[PDB]
Amino acid sequence: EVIVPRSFRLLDELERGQKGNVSEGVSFGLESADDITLSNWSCTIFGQPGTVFENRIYSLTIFCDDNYPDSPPTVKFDTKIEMSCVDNCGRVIKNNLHILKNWNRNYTIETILISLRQEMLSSANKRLPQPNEGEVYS
């Protein structure tokens, strides 16, 4: 098997995100334009139409550590969101998200963003009341 090193793996994901060659409702790029380690990712997921999350954008931050992609990155929302997999500080609970709970190296930052958009559709989160549009954690 061909082992793609961390740096080139992250550069490939960056090329995809920057191009707009991404899934619908998700966007991802680097938090800092000159972050050579490519560790801190500024992300966005769009709220699912027909749910309480609809018509609003959620800014969030994903951090890939030195063992990525062999180990899961950490996820944290900047825009305030009420969900089963998100704690009161915005951090995604690893156990409450299947792709983070059982991480595979083939999963990407995109995969995480899509999986969060899916969790919006679940019966537990679908009708759950949300704070005002554009609120940050405090």
Partner: protein
């Protein structure tokens, strides 16, 4: 003007916890200015840290809001000074402003990099504790010199 807020205000001014100072802002009894000394035996030793505390309308039914104004290199405090404390869902009217400030003070002595709020800072504390504390000690020197 609730009786509890006035009592807590007086309790903090007359009998403050060691290394902690808390006074309200004139013409806003809900706004608080906090000074916490960096604990001994930590990279923050000798430093003075500014914090702001807001009491919401529903207090003490709802928890207060707190964040650092002074920059600090700590795995459980983000770049904007925000913290992640359970007692701010695990909140109860049984707890007081004094409880929150003591909890923040305790956090400076007990950083938990495995339970991080700033993942970048946290990875540094895990990979190289000495160097992370060194950076934190330098931050203390330049950002927390005197208030």
């Amino acid at each position: 003007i609730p009786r509890r807020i006035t009592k807590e205000t007086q309790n903090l001014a007359n009998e403050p916890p060691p290394g902690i100072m808390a006074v309200p802002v004139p013409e806003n009894y809900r706004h608080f200015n906090i000074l916490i000394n960096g604990p001994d035996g930590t990279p923050y030793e000798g430093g003075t840290y500014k914090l702001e505390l807001f009491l919401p309308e529903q207090y003490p039914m709802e928890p207060p809001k707190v964040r650092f104004l002074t920059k600090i290199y700590h795995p459980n405090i983000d770049k904007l000074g925000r913290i992640c404390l359970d007692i701010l869902d695990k909140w109860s009217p049984a707890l007081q402003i004094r409880t929150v400030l003591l909890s923040i003070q305790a956090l400076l002595s007990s950083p938990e990099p495995d339970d991080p709020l700033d993942s970048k800072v946290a990875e540094h504390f895990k990979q190289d504790k000495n160097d992370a504390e060194h950076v934190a000690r330098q931050w203390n020197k330049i950002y927390a010199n005197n208030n």
